[PDB]
Design a protein around this ligand. Structure first.
Ligand SMILES: Nc1ncnc2c1ncn2[C@@H]1O[C@H](COP(=O)(O)OP(=O)(O)OP(=O)(O)O)[C@@H](O)[C@H]1O
Ligand SMILES: [Cl-]
Ligand SMILES: [Mg+2]
Length: 485
């Protein structure tokens, strides 16, 4: 596809046409949906044989309109009370597993996951080549999937935006299993972005809840899931901004936002100040961190709560870079013949140097001023860097200093047999030995305190080595400098 898709997007008229074509290409065909329906029908048959009156509800990527090729098939099986109710649940889970493993034909790789936040049973159907999860209870997943598809129905730009930004995110390494953003979290971030535009593209979940209607009220796990089943009773958006504009605006927005001190509410369509303690007092069980994104229904759940500060910072970095790219003429204007334009450089893999310079380096806690002073102390001395003027400095290195420190250290130890930090490391540095060999930039943001090291001039391409070496070296430096007190 990486060939076919590339030339397909290259031939498009404009950026919007590229995003639309991207949706058209990545989404499940009719045969894939028929196949998934077949599998769901089978699971339904067997589970019916076991649990009379049970209903297998497809949820997630399948029904939320954000479906892509090879996506998971997620199924929800609908059928003195202490913590034991957890154990009971687990039991039932295994029961379901034992049904999947030995009863329904052609399903293998059956793996019970009671340990997960939301308990689930992984499975793979062999003939269809499909895989996914059976959840005994996640009821909210249904309703917020319906909410996603409804959001797609509310504005036609939603699907192109979300598809493009998902592709970009997985291309920039912002989405995955680790403390990366989930596709659902990223989708909710896009929806939040669309809700926060000056004319709103999408309505808030509060407004949809108000829209409601008789009998359409629904409550799950003590949360209000009620929203209209169709978009016909809902007035359209007067925001006329074209797709490319909304994309650039996304990048710029999430790059300019304050994530640490903001819980992003899709319900109220607003940024609620985190510090101190305000949203935490209302809905208990809300874990706050580098990125805070509130579920539209369960308000005690931060969907991004898993994301580490390095990942959030990397997000904002990549978004600043992408916004900077969209400001160019390569993004706006098409190419005469064969050149990469518009969406292509965004969906193309990022250089290893950019790959590293996007994700910052976590530094020990310390006063911003004292920390920055410590850093310029570590670059000035203990490193051969010539330094000059969130705080940022331009640094120039004429030397190989990151490499061969071990040999100089050995030499200095045996020559110590002959006869705290800072200057002692500066010995190791200066004993390692006019256009600069490598010139780079070091930036420390207020929140969190982290160093973003980006290259300027790198003729021989040595920047990644310096970056990894600094990843190891700078925390040690700040550490011993903290221990001098
Ligand atoms: N990290 C999460 N926190 C809370 N709810 C989630 C999370 N991830 C997914 N969900 C809910 O359950 C569904 C899980 O689907 P899944 O884990 O397969 O991701 P997805 O959105 O379906 O995309 P994909 O299928 O490609 O992973 C989501 O659509 C959402 O309804
Ligand atoms: Cl903004
Ligand atoms: Mg899915």
């Amino acid at each position: 596809d990486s060939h076919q898709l590339a030339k397909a997007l290259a031939e498009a008229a404009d950026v919007g046409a590229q995003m639309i074509k991207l949706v058209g290409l990545r989404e499940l065909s009719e045969a894939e949906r028929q196949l998934r329906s077949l599998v769901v029908a089978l699971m339904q048959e067997v589970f019916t044989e076991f649990f009379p009156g049970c209903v297998v509800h497809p949820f997630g990527s399948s029904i939320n309109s954000f479906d892509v090729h090879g996506c998971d098939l997620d199924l929800f099986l609908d059928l003195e009370t202490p913590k034991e109710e957890k154990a009971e649940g687990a039991a039932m889970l295994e029961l379901v597993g034992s049904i999947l493993r030995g009863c329904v034909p052609g399903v293998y790789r059956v793996q019970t996951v009671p340990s997960a936040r939301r308990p689930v049973v992984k499975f793979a159907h062999r003939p269809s080549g499909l895989h996914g999860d059976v959840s005994l209870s996640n009821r909210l997943a249904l309703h917020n999937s319906r909410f996603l598809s409804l959001c797609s129905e509310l504005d036609g730009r939603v699907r192109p935006l979300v598809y493009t930004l998902r592709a970009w995110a997985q291309g920039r390494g912002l989405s995955g299993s680790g403390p990366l953003l989930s596709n659902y979290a990223l989708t909710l971030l896009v929806i939040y972005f669309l809700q926060t535009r000056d004319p709103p593209v999408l309505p808030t979940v509060s407004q949809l809840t108000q829209k409601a209607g008789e009998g359409e009220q629904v409550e799950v796990d003590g949360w209000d899931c009620s929203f209209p089943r169709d978009a016909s009773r809902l007035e359209p958006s007067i925001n006329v901004e074209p797709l490319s504009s909304l994309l650039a605006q996304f990048f710029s927005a999430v790059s300019s936002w304050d994530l640490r001190g903001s819980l992003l509410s899709l319900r109220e369509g607003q940024a609620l100040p985190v510090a101190g303690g305000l949203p935490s007092n209302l809905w208990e069980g809300l874990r706050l961190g580098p990125l805070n994104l509130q579920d539209p229904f369960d308000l005690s759940h931060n969907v991004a709560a898993n994301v580490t500060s390095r990942v959030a910072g990397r997000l904002q970095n990549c978004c600043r870079a992408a916004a900077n790219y969209c400001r160019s003429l390569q993004y706006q204007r098409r190419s005469s013949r064969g050149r990469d334009w518009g969406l292509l450089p965004l969906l193309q893999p990022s250089s290893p140097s950019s790959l590293l310079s996007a994700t910052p380096i976590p530094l020990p806690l310390a006063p911003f001023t004292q920390l920055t002073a410590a850093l310029v102390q570590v670059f000035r001395e203990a490193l051969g860097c010539h330094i000059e003027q969130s705080a940022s400095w331009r640094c120039a290195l004429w030397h190989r200093v990151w490499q061969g420190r071990r040999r100089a250290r050995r030499r200095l130890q045996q020559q110590t047999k002959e006869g705290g930090w800072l200057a002692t490391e500066a010995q190791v540095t200066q004993e390692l030995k006019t256009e600069p060999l490598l010139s780079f930039v070091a930036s420390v943001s207020p929140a969190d305190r982290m160093l973003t090291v980006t290259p300027l001039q790198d003729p021989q391409g040595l920047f990644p080595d310096l970056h990894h070496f600094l990843q190891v070296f700078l925390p040690q430096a700040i550490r011993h400098l903290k221990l001098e007190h």
